[PDB]
């Protein structure tokens, strides 16, 4: 609605100066048809050369001073509309990033892509271009009608009777032609979706010898267009006929009335030239304003999707305010039970209770599924638990500050995504301040990535493209490990650290886990399927069915001959 | 260069079968130009008549010739656009079909290397940009060039002294238009680069949000997107400042030449060498001769982009496919002996990286064969080489004591079928997808294929039976049902050598095995690809695959 479109209020001093310069430019532009009727009346009755000189210098100044004020008026408006479009586009990106995490799973990424990138840039650029054109020609359409009344009312009134009678057939056929033009463009783009569907699955088409069948399916879509295209081409010829004939018939209607009036001595022949020159300029200001208005109406129709996206409220609780200086690192679970809110009918996790302490390693093991990685999601404040209480150093997680908590809790994902940036900054991602050069080298030392990254031709400044093309799965693990080691997290989460690690960095992983001097201020949660690290863990728990089944230390559990005995003998 | 000359003649050979439409369209072009140019000549002749008597023999002749040429200009211009819009549509549909047919025969290494974003732009947007050459860019250029000569032909007839002053300011109007059109295209290219740069920032943040929230860098990604917009905003303002500066130059210059000719033309008319009628005919032409030079320079700039956008398509269409010569051997005796003899394959996109290292084995028609190996060993590449999808670098593949590339393309793929590792379902109906690639079949075989592959049980849950429409990409049905549809797609064809590639697909491999022992009949070769050894047994023989070497 226009009321919700009441932005750009802070710039109302700049926009008012624009509105005072468009009217001053519109008044000084119409001097040209005024001083052609005074010259055509000067020649018809002679006169001094002073009046020739005086009429030329007033047309000299007013036409020059009308082009300058348009140029000052144009840039002003273009300067301010650049700021409003850019400030709002950056404002809609802050809203989506503050939405809940569950917005970003079921709904497609490309749907979020369209609403931010070109459903706002092309919406604003179409509206800012089509609003000034509506604003420029409305004042010229209003300032021309003012002097038409002052000139002669008799020929002015006969324009307004014949105007809507002559501007119904051009827009009735004009409506019919643009209907057929958009039916071609829909069927042309529909056939492109069929052709690109078969091209993206070429191994499937080739293995069934269906190259002839896909050529026939495309030829059926194109043969449908040609049937409706002959009728569309005729409708372009009729539309060009009606616009041309109705425009020309208007010109001869006003000339006959004026010629009868000017031969009766009522008005001079000078005033007829001014009026006819105003007739074409007033008509053009109407037909331009008639074509701009549907485009502006279309743009504000699509503006309700952007503002609904900005006005929706997140479901996640807001960030806390507490930033304590030092953290001990204790975290405990109090009978928690998490369910995915996308399908809350299924309890993924239930009845979980364990405590972690600095200096001890707790390993979570189990089969595929059964909510293995879901426990890591709840720890780093990605979802809220449906049941139970979660405590970090005696305090709940959402009570803590958002940026400080993630700086003290670091995790390694199942498939660690990498972004296309400099690897010096990619290692030091997300820090409040840029660290010095020593810490990145020390992080590469403690991660085992230094043996490979130093062999690059650029080294720490080696650029990486999208989706991690110039790296191996093992090198993707090593680059992620150093990312979680700079900030020195009080609680460290290790999920699938050795999925593709069978080298010296795996030895550095267990060296950091079990014999590094800094383990006494860190708590580690470990989820890998390698049993070599499990047997040295201080605490080992079994996860199956989203609940705790067996527990205790390592040596306490084979003597029970429980589930740990199963895959060891296998 | 001569490269543009061949693109001139190749684009003209494309529009040869539209000869009767171009002749009728180019007739109406010439008829309309002569109609409009004579209108201002009769305008001044009426005024010169309007200084004497109202004699019918000259006044009524000039009025009648006014309305005849006004009718002649408007009626012909309507039929010119009617015959040119139909011509562009016929060219657009001709080059879309011809390109898509030529893109369909390329080797499989072409589609792996080429992104799908580029092929969509060539098909959808570049074909439109090349069909605008003859009906639009050569139409406007020819219409404006004839009209400009016609206007200066009459100006020389009116006053040879006055028309020389029009030629003096001309070289500025050509130079100013050529400079602005060069600068405007340079900015609009830089807009396209910086727009996709800002969309690259939101590319990483939205898709990989889980890594973003894991490190608390939401305010960091907002900061980088706010900075990437400031680079776009500087270029948006630069385009609008240059555009609004060019209009101010054009408006001052237009007034400048109007005063030079109103002053000097009046001084000539007071000396008796010009009449009031010939002055009015001179002034109407002069306002029109400036607006046609600007159109002529602008269009000729755009004609070079139409050829440049037509050189990407003509390079995709003329690229030679890397395929073996087609075979015509289709014996009816196809008992199905498959022999591998020291095969070695390297991917064409990534050469000198061997996958196979001299594999050799033999398949017997009446038995069951199983392949087992680790992930990434190359089991699916053996499936691809068995269907003539590639050429092995070394060795050969022998089918019935013949090389596999020596058979007919339609006959071989109707006898050696497979089920893909990741099934793909198209946008047709269910009945159209089971009988995919089949020229003619009855409804009984489709039902029977669903019965054998356990696809008829869930086919009656949703209405219309087997005529139900499937959504695009197959995103309407369950993942487990998609493998059952893919399996039934193989069996309806009545194949001879059967390949099943479930691999990571489970929880249905025992539903197929329990009914039929991997659908082994006794004269149909069956190859089953699995990851675990404890799963087959059924197979008469087993060949483990490790790093491209059998054990």
């Amino acid at each position: 609605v226009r009321r919700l479109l009441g932005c750009l209020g802070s710039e109302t001093r700049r926009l008012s100066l624009f509105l005072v310069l468009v009217v001053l430019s519109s008044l000084g532009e119409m001097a040209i048809p005024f001083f052609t009727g005074r010259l055509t009346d000067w020649i018809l009755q002679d006169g001094s050369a002073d009046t020739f000189t005086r009429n030329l210098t007033l047309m000299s100044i007013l036409t020059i001073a009308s082009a300058v004020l348009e140029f000052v008026g144009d840039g002003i408006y273009n300067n301010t509309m650049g700021h409003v479009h850019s400030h709002l586009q950056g404002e809609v990106f802050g809203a989506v990033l503050r939405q809940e995490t569950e917005f970003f799973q079921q709904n497609q990424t490309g749907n979020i892509m369209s609403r931010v990138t070109e459903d706002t840039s092309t919406l604003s650029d179409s509206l800012s271009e089509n609003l000034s054109l509506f604003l420029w020609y409305l004042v010229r359409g209003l300032c021309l009608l003012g002097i038409m009344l002052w000139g002669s009312v008799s020929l002015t009134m006969v324009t307004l009777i014949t105007l809507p009678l002559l501007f119904l057939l051009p827009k009735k056929v004009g409506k019919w032609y643009q209907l057929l033009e958009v039916q071609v463009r829909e069927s042309l783009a529909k056939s492109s979706q069929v052709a690109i569907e078969a091209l993206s699955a070429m191994p499937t088409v080739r293995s069934f010898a269906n190259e002839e069948g896909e050529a026939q399916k495309f030829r059926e879509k194109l043969q449908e267009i040609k049937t409706l295209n002959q009728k569309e081409a005729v409708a372009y010829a009729v539309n060009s006929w009606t616009t041309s004939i109705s425009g020309m018939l208007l010109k001869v209607g006003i000339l006959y009335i004026g010629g009868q009036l000017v031969t009766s001595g009522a008005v001079s022949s000078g005033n007829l030239v001014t009026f006819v020159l105003y007739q074409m300029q007033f008509t053009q200001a109407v037909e331009v304003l008639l074509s701009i208005y549907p485009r502006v109406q279309k743009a504000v129709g699509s503006s309700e999707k952007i503002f609904e996206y900005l006005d929706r409220t997140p479901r996640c609780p807001p960030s806390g305010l507490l930033t304590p200086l030092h953290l001990e690192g204790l975290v405990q679970f109090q009978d928690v039970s998490f369910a995915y809110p996308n399908r809350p009918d299924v309890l993924v996790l239930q009845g979980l209770t364990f405590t972690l302490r600095p200096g001890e390693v707790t390993a979570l093991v189990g089969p595929n599924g059964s909510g293995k990685s879901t426990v890591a999601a709840l720890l780093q404040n990605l979802y809220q638990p449906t049941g139970g209480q979660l405590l970090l150093d005696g305090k709940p997680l959402p009570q803590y500050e958002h940026r400080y908590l993630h700086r003290q809790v670091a995790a390694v994902g199942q498939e660690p995504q990498v972004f296309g940036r400099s690897l010096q900054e990619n290692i030091a991602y997300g820090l409040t301040q840029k660290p010095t050069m020593e810490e990145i080298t020390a992080a590469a030392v403690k991660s085992g990535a230094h043996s490979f990254i130093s062999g690059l031709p650029q080294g720490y400044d080696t650029e990486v493209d999208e989706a991690g093309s110039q790296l191996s799965g093992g090198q993707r693990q090593a680059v992620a490990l150093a990312r979680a080691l700079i900030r020195k997290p009080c609680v460290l989460i290790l999920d699938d650290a050795t999925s593709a690690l069978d080298a010296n960095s795996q030895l550095q992983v267990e060296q950091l886990l079990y014999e590094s001097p800094e383990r006494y201020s860190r708590s580690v949660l470990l989820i890998t399927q390698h049993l070599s690290l499990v047997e040295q863990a201080d605490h080992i728990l079994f996860l199956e069915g989203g609940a705790i089944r067996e527990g205790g230390t390592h040596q306490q559990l084979m003597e029970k001959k429980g589930c740990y005995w199963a895959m060891v003998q296998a | 260069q001569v490269n543009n000359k061949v693109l001139m003649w190749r684009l003209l050979k494309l529009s040869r079968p539209d000869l009767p439409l171009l002749v009728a369209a180019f007739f109406f072009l010439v008829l309309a130009v002569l109609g409009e140019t004579l209108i201002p000549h009769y305008s001044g002749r009426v005024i010169d008549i309007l200084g004497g008597d109202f004699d019918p023999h000259a006044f009524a002749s000039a009025i009648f010739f006014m309305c005849l040429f006004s009718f002649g200009s408007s009626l012909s211009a309507g039929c010119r656009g009617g015959c040119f819009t139909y011509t562009m549509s016929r060219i657009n549909l001709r080059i879309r079909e011809q390109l898509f047919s030529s893109l369909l025969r390329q080797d499989l290494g072409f589609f792996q290397e080429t992104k799908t974003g580029e092929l969509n732009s060539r098909l959808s947007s570049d074909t439109t940009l090349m069909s605008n050459w003859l009906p639009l860019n050569a139409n406007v250029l020819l219409r404006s060039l004839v009209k400009v000569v016609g206007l200066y032909g009459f100006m020389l007839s009116i006053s040879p002294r006055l028309t020389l002053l029009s030629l003096l300011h001309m070289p500025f109007t050509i130079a100013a238009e050529k400079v602005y059109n060069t600068r405007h295209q340079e900015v609009l290219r830089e807009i396209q680069d910086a727009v996709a740069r800002a969309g690259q920032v939101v590319r990483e943040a939205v898709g990989g949000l889980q890594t973003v929230r894991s490190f608390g860098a939401e305010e960091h990604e907002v900061c980088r997107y706010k900075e990437a917009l400031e680079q776009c905003r500087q270029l948006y303002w630069r385009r609008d400042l240059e555009r609004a500066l060019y209009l101010l130059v054009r408006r001052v210059l237009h007034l400048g030449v109007q005063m030079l000719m109103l002053s000097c033309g009046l001084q000539q008319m007071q000396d008796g060498e010009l009449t009031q009628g010939s002055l009015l005919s001179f002034m109407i032409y002069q306002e029109s001769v400036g607006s046609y030079v600007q159109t002529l320079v602008y269009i000729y700039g755009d004609m070079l982009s139409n050829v440049g956008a037509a050189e990407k398509v003509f390079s995709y269409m003329d690229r030679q496919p890397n395929l073996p010569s087609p075979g015509t051997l289709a014996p009816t005796t196809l008992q199905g002996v498959v022999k591998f003899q020291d095969v070695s394959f390297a991917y064409p996109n990534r050469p000198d990286r061997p996958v196979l290292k001299g594999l050799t084995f033999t398949l017997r028609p009446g038995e069951v064969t199983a392949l087992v190996g680790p992930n990434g060993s190359g089991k699916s590449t053996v499936a691809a080489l068995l269907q003539n999808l590639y050429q092995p670098t070394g060795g050969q593949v022998l089918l019935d004591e013949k090389p596999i590339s020596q058979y007919e393309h339609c006959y071989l793929h109707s006898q050696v079928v497979s089920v893909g590792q990741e099934p793909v379902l198209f946008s047709g109906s269910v009945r159209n997808n089971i009988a995919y690639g089949l020229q003619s079949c009855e409804d009984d075989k489709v039902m029977a294929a669903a019965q054998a592959a356990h696809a008829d049980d869930f086919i009656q849950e949703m209405e219309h039976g087997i005529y139900t429409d499937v959504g695009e990409k197959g995103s309407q049905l369950a993942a487990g049902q998609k493998q059952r549809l893919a399996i039934a797609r193989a069996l309806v064809r009545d194949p001879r050598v059967l390949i099943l590639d479930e691999a990571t697909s489970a929880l249905d491999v025992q539903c197929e095995q329990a009914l039929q022992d991997w659908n082994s009949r006794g004269d149909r070769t069956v190859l089953v690809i699995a990851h675990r050894l404890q799963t087959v047994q059924r197979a008469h023989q087993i060949l483990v695959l490790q790093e491209g070497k059998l054990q």
Binding site: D74, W136 | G81, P135, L136
Partner: peptide, 9 residues
Amino acid sequence: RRYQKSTEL
């Protein structure tokens, strides 16, 4: 600003 009519075909 000034409207520029798309070119006639």
